[PDB]
Amino acid sequence: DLADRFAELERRYDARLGVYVPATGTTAAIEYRADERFAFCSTFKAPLVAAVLHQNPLTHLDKLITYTSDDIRSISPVAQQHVQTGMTIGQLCDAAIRYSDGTAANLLLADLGGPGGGTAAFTGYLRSLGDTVSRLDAEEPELNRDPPGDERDTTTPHAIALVLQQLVLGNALPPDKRALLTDWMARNTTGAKRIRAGFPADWKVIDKTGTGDYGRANDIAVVWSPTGVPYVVAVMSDRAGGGYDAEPREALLAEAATCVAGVLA
Numbered sequence: 001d002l003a004d005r006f007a008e009l010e011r012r013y014d015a016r017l018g019v020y021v022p023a024t025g026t027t028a029a030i031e032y033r034a035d036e037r038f039a040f041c042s043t044f045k046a047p048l049v050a051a052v053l054h055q056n057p058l059t060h061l062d063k064l065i066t067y068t069s070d071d072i073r074s075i076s077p078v079a080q081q082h083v084q085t086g087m088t089i090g091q092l093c094d095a096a097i098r099y100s101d102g103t104a105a106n107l108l109l110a111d112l113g114g115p116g117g118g119t120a121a122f123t124g125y126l127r128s129l130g131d132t133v134s135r136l137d138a139e140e141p142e143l144n145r146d147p148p149g150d151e152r153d154t155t156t157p158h159a160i161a162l163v164l165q166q167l168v169l170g171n172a173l174p175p176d177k178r179a180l181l182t183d184w185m186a187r188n189t190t191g192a193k194r195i196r197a198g199f200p201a202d203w204k205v206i207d208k209t210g211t212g213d214y215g216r217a218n219d220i221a222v223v224w225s226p227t228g229v230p231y232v233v234a235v236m237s238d239r240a241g242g243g244y245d246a247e248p249r250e251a252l253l254a255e256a257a258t259c260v261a262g263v264l265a
């Protein structure tokens with residue numbers, strides 16, 4: 001009945017819903033439109049932070065990066081206060097994940113591929129995880145403005161949920177580096193009304209949101225249950241048929257998260 005419930009969500013919210021839950025030894029593969037392309041939006045900041053962690057030692061997180069206020073071309077709540085202080089790489093990893101700081105990710109792309117090779121290097125790191133489907137072609141602010149049907153700056157629920165299963169549950173990131181990535185998204189202050197809102201209180205949730213034009217609202221997440229069985233949940237949606245200013249529906253992802261909680265009892 002999962003398909004009949006997920007299509008009702010699309011009928012009631014006027015949007016396209018895509019979900020993917022990787023199979024386990026116990027659970028099966030919960031998939032709805034999981035192989036169609038949705039915009040990354042801010043969801044790419046979580047594997048971009050891990051890209052900085054893999055390519056650099058822990059001593060690199062304390063490197064002072066000096067940016068200007070003219071480098072602030074995107075919604076960047078944390079980089080707005082440290083215009084003259086600069087910020088260490090570990091602090092921009094905190095901003096790009098916990099607060100989805102746009103300027104953080106932009107200079108995070110610079111530290112990875114240089115002034116003009118950041119998006120290609122972030123895409124190459126996803127290839128190193130086995131993800132040959134996702135692609136990042138624009139930086140902030142343009143990666144959230146691509147027209148519907150455009151393949152640029154897109155991933156799939158299947159692709160990004162597989163990637164996060166290697167980031168949080170896999171052995172792509174070493175223990176100590178994995179511990180700070182798991183701590184960063186578990187401190188996130190952007191996804192309270194999304195996947196968290198769909199799973200009960202004694203279920204542990206760690207997530208990274210994404211929101212953009214054409215009613216885009218995403219939230220990639222790994223959920224933990226009271227017994228401890230881990231699950232990766234990827235809820236991506238958009239409301240293309242409403243214009244660039246179509247309002248995203250945060251209750252949509254919560255409802256989809258309630259449905260995947262009902263099959264994970």
Ligand SMILES: CO/N=C(\C(=O)N[C@@H]1C(=O)N2C(C(=O)O)=C(CSc3nc(=O)c(=O)[nH]n3C)CS[C@H]12)c1csc(N)n1
Pocket residue numbers: 041042043074075099100102141142144189190209210211212213214
């Ligand atoms: C050019 O960039 N345009 C953006 C944009 O910066 N997108 C990013 C993205 O995915 N972001 C996220 C997030 O973490 O998910 C969000 C959504 S989370 C959120 N935080 C708050 O503090 C709050 O009061 N309300 N909400 C909803 C902010 S924008 C950034 C945008 C956002 S909505 C829209 N029409 N455009």
